[PDB]
Amino acid sequence: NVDQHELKAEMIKELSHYYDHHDLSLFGKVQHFVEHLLEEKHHAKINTSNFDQKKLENFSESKQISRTVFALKKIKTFNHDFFTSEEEMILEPLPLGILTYGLKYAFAGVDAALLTYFWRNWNFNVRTIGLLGGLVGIQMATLHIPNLVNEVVIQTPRRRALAKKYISAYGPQFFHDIVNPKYDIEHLRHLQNKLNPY
Amino acid sequence: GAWNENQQHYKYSKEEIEAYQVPMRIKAGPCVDTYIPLKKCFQENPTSFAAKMLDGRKGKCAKEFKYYNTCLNHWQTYENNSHVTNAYWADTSKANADGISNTYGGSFRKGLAWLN
Amino acid sequence: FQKYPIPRYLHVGQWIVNKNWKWNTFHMFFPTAILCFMVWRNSMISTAKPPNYGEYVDPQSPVAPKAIKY
Amino acid sequence: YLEPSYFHETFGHMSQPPKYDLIDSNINGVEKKLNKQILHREHNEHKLDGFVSMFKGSDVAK
Amino acid sequence: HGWDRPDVPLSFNPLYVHKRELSIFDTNMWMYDQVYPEYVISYNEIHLVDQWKGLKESFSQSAYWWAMMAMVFGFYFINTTPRQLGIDTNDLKGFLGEYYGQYKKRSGIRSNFLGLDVTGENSIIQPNYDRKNGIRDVIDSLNADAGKRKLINLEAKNFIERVEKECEQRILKKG
Amino acid sequence: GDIRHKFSNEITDDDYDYQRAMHVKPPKEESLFQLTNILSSVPVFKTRFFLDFIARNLDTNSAVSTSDFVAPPRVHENSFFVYHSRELGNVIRKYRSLESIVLPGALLTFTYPLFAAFVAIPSYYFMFNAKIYEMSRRFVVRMDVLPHLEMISVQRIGAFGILYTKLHRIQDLEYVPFDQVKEQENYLWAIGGHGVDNQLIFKDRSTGEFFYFERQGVWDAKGLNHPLLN
Numbered sequence: 014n015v016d017q018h019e020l021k022a023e024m025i026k027e028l029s030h031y032y033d034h035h036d037l038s039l040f041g042k043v044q045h046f047v048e049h050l051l052e053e054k055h056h057a058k059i060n061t062s063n064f065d066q067k068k069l070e071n072f073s074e075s076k077q078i079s080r081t082v083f084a085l086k087k088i089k090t091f092n093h094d095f096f097t098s099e100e101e102m103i104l105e106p107l108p109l110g111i112l113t114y115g116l117k118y119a120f121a122g123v124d125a126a127l128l129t130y131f132w133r134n135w136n137f138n139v140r141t142i143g144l145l146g147g148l149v150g151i152q153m154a155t156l157h158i159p160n161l162v163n164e165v166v167i168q169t170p171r172r173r174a175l176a177k178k179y180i181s182a183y184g185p186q187f188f189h190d191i192v193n194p195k196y197d198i199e200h201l202r203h204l205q206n207k208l209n210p211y
Numbered sequence: 212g213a214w215n216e217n218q219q220h221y222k223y224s225k226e227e228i229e230a231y232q233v234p235m236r237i238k239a240g241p242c243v244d245t246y247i248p249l250k251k252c253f254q255e256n257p258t259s260f261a262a263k264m265l266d267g268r269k270g271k272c273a274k275e276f277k278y279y280n281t282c283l284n285h286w287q288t289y290e291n292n293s294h295v296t297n298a299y300w301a302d303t304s305k306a307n308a309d310g311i312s313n314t315y316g317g318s319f320r321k322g323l324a325w326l327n
Numbered sequence: 328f329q330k331y332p333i334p335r336y337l338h339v340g341q342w343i344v345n346k347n348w349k350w351n352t353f354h355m356f357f358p359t360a361i362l363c364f365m366v367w368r369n370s371m372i373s374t375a376k377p378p379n380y381g382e383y384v385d386p387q388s389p390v391a392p393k394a395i396k397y
Numbered sequence: 398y399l400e401p402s403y404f405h406e407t408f409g410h411m412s413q414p415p416k417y418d419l420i421d422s423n424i425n426g427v428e429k430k431l432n433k434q435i436l437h438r439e440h441n442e443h444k445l446d447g448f449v450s451m452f453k454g455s456d457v458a459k
Numbered sequence: 460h461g462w463d464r465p466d467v468p469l470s471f472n473p474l475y476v477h478k479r480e481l482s483i484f485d486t487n488m489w490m491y492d493q494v495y496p497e498y499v500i501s502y503n504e505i506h507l508v509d510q511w512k513g514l515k516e517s518f519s520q521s522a523y524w525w526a527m528m529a530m531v532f533g534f535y536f537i538n539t540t541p542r543q544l545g546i547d548t549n550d551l552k553g554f555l556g557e558y559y560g561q562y563k564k565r566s567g568i569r570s571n572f573l574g575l576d577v578t579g580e581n582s583i584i585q586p587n588y589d590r591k592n593g594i595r596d597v598i599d600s601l602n603a604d605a606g607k608r609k610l611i612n613l614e615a616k617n618f619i620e621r622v623e624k625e626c627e628q629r630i631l632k633k634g
Numbered sequence: 635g636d637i638r639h640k641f642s643n644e645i646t647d648d649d650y651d652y653q654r655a656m657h658v659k660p661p662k663e664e665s666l667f668q669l670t671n672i673l674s675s676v677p678v679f680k681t682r683f684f685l686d687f688i689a690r691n692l693d694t695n696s697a698v699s700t701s702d703f704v705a706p707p708r709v710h711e712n713s714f715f716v717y718h719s720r721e722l723g724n725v726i727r728k729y730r731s732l733e734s735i736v737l738p739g740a741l742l743t744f745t746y747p748l749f750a751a752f753v754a755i756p757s758y759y760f761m762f763n764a765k766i767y768e769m770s771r772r773f774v775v776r777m778d779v780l781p782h783l784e785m786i787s788v789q790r791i792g793a794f795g796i797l798y799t800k801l802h803r804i805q806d807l808e809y810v811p812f813d814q815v816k817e818q819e820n821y822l823w824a825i826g827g828h829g830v831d832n833q834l835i836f837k838d839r840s841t842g843e844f845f846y847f848e849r850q851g852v853w854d855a856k857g858l859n860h861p862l863l864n
């Protein structure tokens with residue numbers, strides 16, 4: 014059979030506008046075009062044979078747990094039937110809550126009120142523009158902070174516990190072999206999770 | 212393999228389906244096989260109306276819920292033709308050029324208001 | 328509306344209040360409850376309910392509807 | 398809050414809050430970059446395979 | 460409170476002295492009552508004179524609302540495309556299949572079970588196996604819509620297969 | 635005539651404090667969570683920088699009214715100011731300036747400007763023009779009397795929030811009766827005839843121009859009591 018990577022790349026190129034191009038505004042399309050160049054390079058074929066691996070003996074206990082968590086994330090990306098609902102939730106970020114949505118909405122409302130005060134009073138100056146830009150940057154940084162705080166505080170203990178449970182169940186050698194770039198995703202999709210009752 | 216096929220891929224007899232008290236609306240659809248395990252788990256695992264309407268992953272009935280979700284998505288996409296509909300909505304020119312669906316494209320008028 | 332005199336000879340129920348309403352209510356509730364229980368038993372004597380969940384009607388049983396044999 | 402599809406209809410689908418796991422930093426090195434590229438390719442191929450299945454999965458039931 | 464209001468005055472139900480002869484020409488045309496007898500029917504729109512005049516005025520006034528409805532319908536029809544709705548395509552043997560089966564059964568044209576030589580045609584409500592009217596046209600339209608939807612889905616699947624084959628060939632053609 | 639003191643268990647005035655959120659009452663006490671209490675308690679507000687920012691931001695003291703008689707700037711050399719809009723004109727100008735941003739902002743931010751137009755067209759035709767657009771069109775923001783040309787120099791608002799002044803013949807001015815202009819502009823006078831005095835409206839007969847003055851506008855007695863304006 015032909016290379017699945019090349020076939021999928023050609024199909025995606027043909028049907029990207031049929032699956033990923035949505036109807037948006039003028040500025041929306043402009044931003045989407047800016048992001049398209051800014052989008053990372055998705056190479057269908059990846060030269061993974063150039064990697065030089067290191068033994069798990071070099072890694073520490075928390076390092077091995079992190080490697081197992083990374084392998085679990087890679088499997089969840091590849092093998093969608095490996096973990097249970099609770100394990101999948103543990104391995105992924107928590108949903109955005111009322112506090113986060115309200116913070117975003119309050120930042121948007123404050124910006125809207127400031128813009129109304131500016132335009133209605135025609136109070137547009139260099140100082141006002143700089144203050145608005147700084148406020149926008151600070152709001153973006155703070156919105157990224159709540160996600161970071163929630164993700165870290167929640168997942169890191171949960172991820173560590175889940176990895177430690179899976180480390181004893183599967184093995185650090187299996188986890189490192191999954192972390193090794195030489196693994197095949199085709200077999201990784203057909204691999205069975207020993208903790209899956211099915 | 213099939214979207215409507217259950218994880219174990221077994222066909223339920225009419226006697227079992229009537230014993231499962233599956234809704235006639237579900238029986239009309241082609242996703243009965245997956246809905247059988249989900250219904251069995253839900254009957255075996257009682258959840259309140261607030262619980263079911265509030266639980267996102269459907270609680271314990273998770274794998275059957277995912278299988279039924281896939282089957283129902285396939286059924287609702289096929290019965291509404293929403294796949295080709297969204298395809299033509301994404302790009303009327305591309306769909307007309309590719310000849311994906313002659314019948315769908317021959318009466319495809321996006322409308323002046325909807326971006327002409 | 329402001330209450331107005333009504334004929335004592337007239338058998339009217341216009342704003343009629345009985346001081347001994349408690350005993351009358353108790354008496355009209357208890358025997359009525361007994362009669363209702365008897366009627367409920369009589370009605371439940373002949374009842375039809377859908378078959379229980381997980382129970383399938385085997386067509387060979389006489390409980391399944393029958394056909395007139397010509 | 399739980400049914401914002403009404404807001405998604407009249408006001409459109411606005412910008413959601415930044416939702417990301419940010420868990421790929423568990424390891425370091427070019428292996429991490431290769432894994433990120435593999436994950437991006439996996440997401441793209443998952444989209445393509447979903448399109449292919451939803452296009453061909455109409456004849457599964459007859 | 461503050462005033463010992465007397466009993467309700469008897470004037471609250473004044474007695475009507477019939478000043479006009481209730482001619483038999485209007486029998487039951489007036490609801491008779493010892494206090495405030497009334498007409499049998501009420502016309503609170505007495506500003507409208509007659510039934511023909513009232514109908515003309517109502518039809519004149521309803522034109523604005525009819526035009527508003529027409530404007531709404533036009534705004535909807537000039538900004539929307541036909542949708543894809545119909546009977547459940549996966550189930551052809553139900554409401555649709557049963558109709559064709561009954562039309563192919565025609566059991567109402569069989570002989571009597573006891574040899575009475577009387578068929579369903581021998582009745583005021585007699586079976587007719589060749590009606591082809593009423594809801595039959597709607598059933599045919601629903602079947603046509605279901606067939607069109609199924610053909611659209613099949614054509615979409617075939618076109619997707621053709622696209623995949625062309626992509627595979629082009630990837631193979633380059634070598 | 636309350637008899638609340640007679641009975642002990644009767645509802646007291648101190649209990650009826652949650653009703654202040656819906657029933658307006660004269661101040662009896664300032665709450666701990668009150669904004670005034672928060673301002674007067676926190677030492678952060680006692681800093682000099684906060685006071686300096688408060689004294690040097692928002693509205694300025696110069697633009698605040700200080701007299702019962704005011705004189706606007708002179709449009710020309712020999713003209714005489716007569717009437718001037720104070721707040722209604724400013725609000726109308728702000729509303730007309732909204733289209734200077736919303737129209738481009740929506741054009742660059744709406745996925746379906748065609749849908750936006752198909753929606754707003756009846757809104758202007760049936761609901762907006764008769765409310766705001768035509769009212770501002772007939773609005774007289776400033777009116778002075780130029781004696782050299784014996785004309786009236788009137789500056790009024792324009793669609794995109796602009797200002798435009800024109801000179802009209804005083805002999806072309808006629809008193810417009812509200813009854814004479816009632817029915818033909820019924821919805822215009824119904825929905826948006828509230829802000830202008832229907833008892834005082836003028837008309838330039840040369841081009842059929844309708845001049846409307848705000849019911850709260852400022853009129854100068856010296857200009858009104860002039861030989862040109864009788």
Ligand SMILES: Nc1ncnc2c1ncn2[C@@H]1O[C@H](COP(=O)(O)OP(=O)(O)O)[C@@H](O)[C@H]1O
Nearest residue numbers: 475476477478479480481482485489496497498
């Ligand atoms: N028996 C009747 N014959 C004709 N018209 C009647 C009769 N009874 C009532 N009406 C109509 O009902 C209306 C009410 O009459 P009524 O109020 O009793 O007279 P008045 O207004 O002099 O007190 C009258 O205008 C009359 O035309």
